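Input set for joint prediction.
Command: fold jointly, output tokens.
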Amino acid sequence: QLVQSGAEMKTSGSSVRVSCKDSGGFFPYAGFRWVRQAPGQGFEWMGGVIPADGTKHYAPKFQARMKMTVVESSRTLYMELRSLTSTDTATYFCARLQCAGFSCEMDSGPFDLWGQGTQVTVPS
Amino acid sequence: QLVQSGAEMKTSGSSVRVSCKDSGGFFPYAGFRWVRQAPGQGFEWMGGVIPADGTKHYAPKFQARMKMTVVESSRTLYMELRSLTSTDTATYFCARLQCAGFSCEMDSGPFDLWGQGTQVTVPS
Amino acid sequence: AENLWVTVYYGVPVWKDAETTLFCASDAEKHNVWATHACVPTDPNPQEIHLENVTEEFNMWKNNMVEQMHTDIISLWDQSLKPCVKLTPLCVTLQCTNVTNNITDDMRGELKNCSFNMTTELRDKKQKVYSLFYRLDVVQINENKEYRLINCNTSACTQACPKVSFEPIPIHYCAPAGFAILKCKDKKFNGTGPCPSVSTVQCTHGIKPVVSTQLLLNGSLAEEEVMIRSENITNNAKNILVQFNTPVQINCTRPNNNTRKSIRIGPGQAFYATGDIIGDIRQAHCNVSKATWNETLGKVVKQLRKHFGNNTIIRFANSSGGDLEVTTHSFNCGGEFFYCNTSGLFNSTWISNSNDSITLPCRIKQIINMWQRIGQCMYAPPIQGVIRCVSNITGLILTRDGGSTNSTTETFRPGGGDMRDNWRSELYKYKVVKIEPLGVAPTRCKRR
Amino acid sequence: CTRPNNNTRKSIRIGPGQAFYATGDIIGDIRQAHCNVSKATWNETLGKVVKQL
Amino acid sequence: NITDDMRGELKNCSFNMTTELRDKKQKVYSLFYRLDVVQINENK
Amino acid sequence: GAVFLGFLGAAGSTMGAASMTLTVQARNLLSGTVWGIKQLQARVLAVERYLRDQQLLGIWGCSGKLICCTNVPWNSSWSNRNLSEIWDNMTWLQWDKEISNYTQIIYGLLEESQNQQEKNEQDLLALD
Amino acid sequence: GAVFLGFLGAAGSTMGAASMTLTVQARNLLSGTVWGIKQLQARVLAVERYLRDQQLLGIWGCSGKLICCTNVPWNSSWSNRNLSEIWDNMTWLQWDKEISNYTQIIYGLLEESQNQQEKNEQDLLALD
Amino acid sequence: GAVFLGFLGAAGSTMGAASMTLTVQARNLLSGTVWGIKQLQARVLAVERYLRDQQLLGIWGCSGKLICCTNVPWNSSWSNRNLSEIWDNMTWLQWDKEISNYTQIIYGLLEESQNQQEKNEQDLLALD
Ligand SMILES: *[C@@H]1O[C@H](CO)[C@@H](O[C@@H]2O[C@H](CO)[C@@H](O[C@@H]3O[C@H](CO[C@H]4O[C@H](CO)[C@@H](O)[C@H](O)[C@@H]4O)[C@@H](O)[C@H](O[C@H]4O[C@H](CO)[C@@H](O)[C@H](O)[C@@H]4O[C@H]4O[C@H](CO)[C@@H](O)[C@H](O)[C@@H]4O[C@H]4O[C@H](CO)[C@@H](O)[C@H](O)[C@@H]4O)[C@@H]3O)[C@H](O)[C@H]2NC(C)=O)[C@H](O)[C@H]1NC(C)=O
Ligand SMILES: *[C@@H]1O[C@H](CO)[C@@H](O[C@@H]2O[C@H](CO)[C@@H](O[C@@H]3O[C@H](CO[C@H]4O[C@H](CO)[C@@H](O)[C@H](O)[C@@H]4O)[C@@H](O)[C@H](O[C@H]4O[C@H](CO)[C@@H](O)[C@H](O)[C@@H]4O)[C@@H]3O)[C@H](O)[C@H]2NC(C)=O)[C@H](O)[C@H]1NC(C)=O
Ligand SMILES: *[C@@H]1O[C@H](CO)[C@@H](O[C@@H]2O[C@H](CO)[C@@H](O[C@@H]3O[C@H](CO)[C@@H](O)[C@H](O)[C@@H]3O)[C@H](O)[C@H]2NC(C)=O)[C@H](O)[C@H]1NC(C)=O
Ligand SMILES: *[C@@H]1O[C@H](CO)[C@@H](O[C@@H]2O[C@H](CO)[C@@H](O[C@@H]3O[C@H](CO)[C@@H](O)[C@H](O)[C@@H]3O)[C@H](O)[C@H]2NC(C)=O)[C@H](O)[C@H]1NC(C)=O
Ligand SMILES: *[C@@H]1O[C@H](CO)[C@@H](O[C@@H]2O[C@H](CO)[C@@H](O[C@@H]3O[C@H](CO)[C@@H](O)[C@H](O)[C@@H]3O)[C@H](O)[C@H]2NC(C)=O)[C@H](O)[C@H]1NC(C)=O
Ligand SMILES: *[C@@H]1O[C@H](CO)[C@@H](O[C@@H]2O[C@H](CO)[C@@H](O[C@@H]3O[C@H](CO)[C@@H](O)[C@H](O)[C@@H]3O)[C@H](O)[C@H]2NC(C)=O)[C@H](O)[C@H]1NC(C)=O
Ligand SMILES: *[C@@H]1O[C@H](CO)[C@@H](O[C@@H]2O[C@H](CO)[C@@H](O[C@@H]3O[C@H](CO)[C@@H](O)[C@H](O)[C@@H]3O)[C@H](O)[C@H]2NC(C)=O)[C@H](O)[C@H]1NC(C)=O
Ligand SMILES: *[C@@H]1O[C@H](CO)[C@@H](O[C@@H]2O[C@H](CO)[C@@H](O[C@@H]3O[C@H](CO)[C@@H](O)[C@H](O)[C@@H]3O)[C@H](O)[C@H]2NC(C)=O)[C@H](O)[C@H]1NC(C)=O
Ligand SMILES: *[C@@H]1O[C@H](CO)[C@@H](O[C@@H]2O[C@H](CO)[C@@H](O)[C@H](O)[C@H]2NC(C)=O)[C@H](O)[C@H]1NC(C)=O
Ligand SMILES: *[C@@H]1O[C@H](CO)[C@@H](O[C@@H]2O[C@H](CO)[C@@H](O)[C@H](O)[C@H]2NC(C)=O)[C@H](O)[C@H]1NC(C)=O
Ligand SMILES: *[C@@H]1O[C@H](CO)[C@@H](O[C@@H]2O[C@H](CO)[C@@H](O)[C@H](O)[C@H]2NC(C)=O)[C@H](O)[C@H]1NC(C)=O
Ligand SMILES: *[C@@H]1O[C@H](CO)[C@@H](O[C@@H]2O[C@H](CO)[C@@H](O)[C@H](O)[C@H]2NC(C)=O)[C@H](O)[C@H]1NC(C)=O
Ligand SMILES: *[C@@H]1O[C@H](CO)[C@@H](O[C@@H]2O[C@H](CO)[C@@H](O)[C@H](O)[C@H]2NC(C)=O)[C@H](O)[C@H]1NC(C)=O
Ligand SMILES: *[C@@H]1O[C@H](CO)[C@@H](O[C@@H]2O[C@H](CO)[C@@H](O)[C@H](O)[C@H]2NC(C)=O)[C@H](O)[C@H]1NC(C)=O
Ligand SMILES: *[C@@H]1O[C@H](CO)[C@@H](O)[C@H](O)[C@H]1NC(C)=O
Ligand SMILES: *[C@@H]1O[C@H](CO)[C@@H](O)[C@H](O)[C@H]1NC(C)=O
Ligand SMILES: *[C@@H]1O[C@H](CO)[C@@H](O)[C@H](O)[C@H]1NC(C)=O
Ligand SMILES: *[C@@H]1O[C@H](CO)[C@@H](O)[C@H](O)[C@H]1NC(C)=O
Ligand SMILES: *[C@@H]1O[C@H](CO)[C@@H](O)[C@H](O)[C@H]1NC(C)=O
Ligand SMILES: *[C@@H]1O[C@H](CO)[C@@H](O)[C@H](O)[C@H]1NC(C)=O
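tokens >
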């Protein structure tokens, strides 16, 4: 399962680093996604990283603010959001693309394994 | 299949180089033979080359005239007949020893796969 | 005065042609195949010194730093496949069917989803798993479905590593201490003979190793005119390494949008398949602008009459025949190996006298045999997204025809083969010399 | 030393591009290998050795 | 025809071998010397 | 005047002028996986063939020196040429091509002369 | 008096005294699988960087010598210091820290001076 | 007269005569997969143990020289033998067997003497 950092609280301008460690492998086999959920309204694509080829894919909005890294030793994804704002308050999820047995999607599927969420609140 | 060079015409004294490329592998597994057919009368053993160990076996007649080589890159057998004569006009075949499934003869069997022939005519 | 005695001079400028071991000097992201990160960091502002009044006899055909670069590249391409997966479990009876989604009738029956059984984690359980293969990788088994990979009758392949990238990076070939690399800075240098203006350099320029078949790509252009080179141009068993002076831009693309899907074939080793093609399937191709291609063909045919007479019909033809990697402009474009059909560029007849392009249709393979070895193949993993590369056609590799009776017609059909000509089109300027200091010369002096 | 049988190889394929060179057939009649050491010039060298021993 | 000195010193042992395909088997034979084969179940 | 201050920059100038710029050759003569063994064979070779030259100089009368005048008479049959014609016209390559054959003979003469000189100096110190 | 007879034992004594114990540094400067390649790269390196120093000395006026007095005037802009203050107070590290910048300039002066001296000695022997 | 012109050819002749043919030993002392590493360890060793000898000579008063007369008094307790009996009777092996023990002591004396000579020459140039 993927497990994330605890809920945080930051100031308007500071940088927040979420984390996502997947207990069970799945690192060189699937492609993970970063999705945040504003309070009580849908989801919002925010990134995607295939750790097998090391290809990152940032959304156009969060293209210059954030950057996501991989650490193969500890098997952890990091998503560092630099220029926070009052509107970046959301529950941040890391997901994983669908795996039908032993053949895992790497490029485009529905997210079937989610993280618990990391509620980052930034009031200003 | 084994496919050979096109029909040629040479002069009495010149050297002719036939070729034999085998599309399908069979190079390090079987042993190939060079057999020429005078116009409308039987066959005549002329050589034999196992490309796995690289052992050539020339007939006594064509022992000093010819020489045959192997090229593993392009998978081609060559037979260069140096001292031509008016009596060396014949259809030149390259064959392959019998293969019963996946176990191919290397030393002595009946020829089961032939080349199309290379009609070399040398009048004088 | 006339009483001359021997003197020795250490550190004296004198060289002799020699052969040594050169080392790469590429500059210092995912690693590539040419391991241009174990190379000595490129020395910037290299000290090219002009050598005046010296006339050295070069030779680009008996050169030896082109026989050394070839084996370097081979042994350096093999060393990046040891850590990678070995696709032996994949040699299995597949069950292919044509892909069911909108397919242009040109790309009809060129892809098939073959569903096979695979070994699980557990050596006893099997899984029914599927993938998408190209028609040039599967071969039918019992002609009476049931295909099999093309290379289960010869060596099994080692799937490349998806982290490793095939993109060619400039390599600088340096000469060890005590040696020197003499380049022939000279415009109309047909390859052999003396070079009335030589210079010294420590490291050759960036020689990016590209592996094309019959159209040299991303090369270095000539200085003023389209220079034709060959061992003996009168012979029709030696290729003719034409080199342009203006690049012909070629746009190669693969318009399908693939989608990888990693399949686990053992304990901690995956096989990256192709799960699905999103959209409609469309044939790959390449575009070469007909105006700027016909013009460079005119230039070449003009420079080919300086060796064959002005009243000579020079016509081009498409390739002769043989394997797919020799009758076809093979290359790799972002990690996908195209096999294009150049029978549209080489089709014309020349006699002594817009905005359209020449779409040549390419095939694609994943099971590749580089350097034409017997017991070596290599599965190339899929690449996601539309692929598009923009190259420069810099040279050709033509082959004359043995047309006898001195017919006024000459056919030039392209032909590749040994990759050495690709380097030799870049290592024609250079030769490696061995400095021999410590000369002896008489003068009027005597040791006390 | 001699081996008088006339063997006949036959390569068997046991995997992807790797063969096992078996022995398909023995042509003729089968006969035991052996070696011949001339008894005169062997007994004489044994005499020399026993003299030096 | 085997001379009684070389009797029982060669045997054609016919086994099953893996084909190109990891799932198919082929019944193939060869000739081994008596110093290479060892009987298994003393009760071919 | 700048490129002549570069490695081999005097490869076309006359012996008289080339034998003025010698240090720039003598300095760039040692200074300088699949590439780990291709640059290790390059190191252990550049040092191995420089020490041969230094030893050849050492066993002759002159080690650690660039223009060494020795005590071996120039046998005129080797080149039979005047001085002003070779120190002002020919280049060093042009001269090596002329004397390439008549070498490996001079080296023995130099060795013998130097060892005899060592023994003679030892004798001269002995009777003191 | 014993540890000062050890390698780097005079690293704190003044230049005047340290430049008396020089052989003990010059001697321990060449003498000295997964460890077969870690001790082979250590051998081919210790010899490769010692010959650089010996060549630097040889192309200057002095090879095979420890205190070599040369013929290049000391440009006072390099250190502008008296003698009794640097040969009796500073240590060698303290001095290298002062002259680390104004180096790689002196080496060219030394090379040029030595080659000129070779040519002048050759000329002096010529007119004899 | 020919085999005595070969490597070690004088290994039986007296010290007086053997010390005449020295260059033929000093020349063949550097010149010279599973065999790629067996002939690489042979190269990086032949050069590594030659530089030890050249350095030992250099730190003594004599580098690039074959018969070097030094300035260290021969302590008669080492061999207590006359000259005409060792330069005309014994061979070099026969002598090394006699002095094998009383070595590694002489080397320090030579080093100290040479460095003192360097400093004394520096002083002699200083007061000039
Ligand atoms: C001869 O020489 C010439 C020049 O010397 C060679 O030309 C080179 O060819 C390369 C091979 O294609 C080409 O490489 C591409 O570079 C693109 C730009 O690279 C820079 O930007 C990216 C991201 O901004 C950086 O990561 C990178 O380090 C560089 O800074 C890349 O964008 C390309 O990757 C994409 O394309 C390839 C193939 O098309 C895909 O496999 C790959 O996964 C990427 O896919 C994206 O793009 C396709 C459409 O092209 C989409 O379908 C796909 O979904 C991806 O798009 C998403 O993501 C992007 C980015 O976020 C977003 O814009 C998009 O909307 C989607 O969200 C590829 O890496 C070189 O650039 C090119 N030039 C040079 C100077 O090297 C030529 O090959 C030589 N010829 C031979 C024979 O050797
Ligand atoms: C290459 O070939 C493979 C097959 O090896 C194709 O994959 C199959 O695609 C078909 C068609 O989309 C799939 O069939 C569909 O299955 C649905 C339920 O499947 C479940 O059960 C199977 C096992 O039985 C599971 O493996 C699977 O994951 C599901 O959990 C049905 O409900 C579908 O029927 C419905 O839709 C069709 C029209 O789409 C209607 O006709 C029906 O009446 C009904 O409404 C449908 O039958 C099949 O499951 C896929 N197999 C696998 C293993 O995934 C690839 O698509 C093909 N590649 C291409 C085309 O590029
Ligand atoms: C290889 O197999 C192992 C064992 O099956 C996988 O690890 C295990 O995965 C299961 C399935 O998710 C985990 O069970 C889960 O537990 C959580 C609570 O932690 C529960 O909420 C879920 O519903 C589910 O039951 C199990 O904990 C986990 N065991 C570990 C991590 O020790 C592993 O993921 C597999 N790896 C690959 C690459 O396939
Ligand atoms: C490994 O298997 C492949 C695939 O079966 C072999 O290649 C194929 O061999 C068949 C059998 O000869 C070829 O079919 C033949 O085609 C010719 C026409 O060219 C026809 O006249 C024959 O009757 C027969 O049908 C087929 O073309 C060929 N495919 C190729 C070469 O791509 C291959 O030979 C096998 N290799 C080994 C080492 O076993
Ligand atoms: C480059 O290739 C050309 C061929 O295009 C070489 O010239 C040709 O070389 C062949 C073989 O040496 C000559 O054939 C000979 O002809 C004589 C009669 O002239 C005949 O008695 C011999 O038995 C042999 O057949 C041919 O004459 C010659 N010239 C042509 C074809 O015009 C050329 O030598 C090659 N350049 C090299 C090797 O540097
Ligand atoms: C290489 O050249 C070919 C042909 O010159 C290019 O294919 C052509 O691309 C154009 C540009 O989109 C297509 O035009 C559009 O076609 C669609 C569908 O028919 C139509 O709805 C639009 O109104 C517009 O006409 C064209 O159809 C297409 N095919 C042709 C002309 O036969 C190709 O794009 C070039 N590729 C590269 C990499 O340069
Ligand atoms: C191969 O693809 C390249 C694209 O990478 C094509 O080159 C590009 O061609 C377009 C025209 O379709 C050029 O657009 C030009 O833009 C300038 C202003 O930027 C405008 O003034 C011109 O009127 C024109 O619209 C574009 O600059 C050019 N790109 C480069 C780098 O030169 C090329 O034509 C394609 N060739 C073939 C044979 O398909
Ligand atoms: C082992 O085999 C060798 C053969 O390789 C035997 O040596 C050969 O013995 C024959 C006699 O049977 C010798 O023939 C002699 O020929 C000369 C003229 O050539 C003739 O004057 C003699 O009267 C006799 O017929 C043959 O020369 C000889 N070969 C050699 C190389 O010496 C050998 O006897 C065999 N030994 C045993 C123990 O079987
Ligand atoms: C994958 O494995 C299954 C299980 O063995 C195969 O299904 C059997 O195939 C054979 C061959 O035709 C049939 O005789 C059996 O009746 C099948 N069993 C079942 C339960 O359907 C299947 O063919 C394999 N697929 C491959 C090898 O592509
Ligand atoms: C080169 O061009 C020739 C046309 O002259 C092509 O030859 C034809 O190819 C088609 C397609 O396979 C066949 O149906 C014809 O029978 C061929 N005709 C002849 C005379 O060969 C050829 O395919 C082209 N490409 C090559 C040779 O690689
Ligand atoms: C390479 O392209 C040429 C033409 O672009 C192909 O030759 C044509 O092939 C079609 C069938 O695919 C025939 O109907 C035509 O008669 C051929 N000649 C033409 C159009 O002039 C050639 O087949 C292609 N190469 C390969 C290997 O197929
Ligand atoms: C080679 O080029 C020639 C002409 O340059 C082509 O010959 C004709 O091409 C037109 C296309 O505009 C066709 O309509 C004609 O049918 C062609 N003539 C014949 C006799 O077929 C030829 O098709 C080109 N070949 C290839 C393979 O591209
Ligand atoms: C293809 O060729 C063009 C033209 O030669 C190259 O563009 C030149 O690149 C050089 C550097 O290598 C620059 O100094 C020139 O200014 C460029 N000229 C123009 C007109 O842009 C191009 O780099 C080559 N390679 C490609 C396009 O991948
Ligand atoms: C080769 O494989 C075949 C197929 O399994 C074996 O034949 C079977 O052998 C077992 C063992 O005695 C019998 O119970 C079956 O009845 C046989 N099946 C058939 C169809 O005959 C054969 O024994 C194997 N040969 C070996 C291993 O040498
Ligand atoms: C040869 O070249 C040198 C290069 O410096 C030049 O000085 C000399 O004058 C030239 N000699 C000629 C052209 O005769
Ligand atoms: C599949 O494609 C092949 C082309 O090789 C064709 O012969 C066959 O009829 C096609 N079958 C179906 C069902 O599309
Ligand atoms: C290259 O030039 C030399 C000298 O002019 C000439 O001898 C040689 O034949 C030329 N090479 C070709 C292929 O024309
Ligand atoms: C190519 O150009 C030449 C002249 O430059 C012209 O005669 C010929 O018709 C052109 N060919 C094409 C196909 O445009
Ligand atoms: C061997 O030779 C010896 C004498 O040479 C003789 O006495 C003895 O009988 C010989 N033995 C045989 C077996 O010939
Ligand atoms: C086969 O040879 C063995 C020798 O080990 C013998 O015991 C057995 O009887 C023989 N059987 C046949 C049928 O020849």
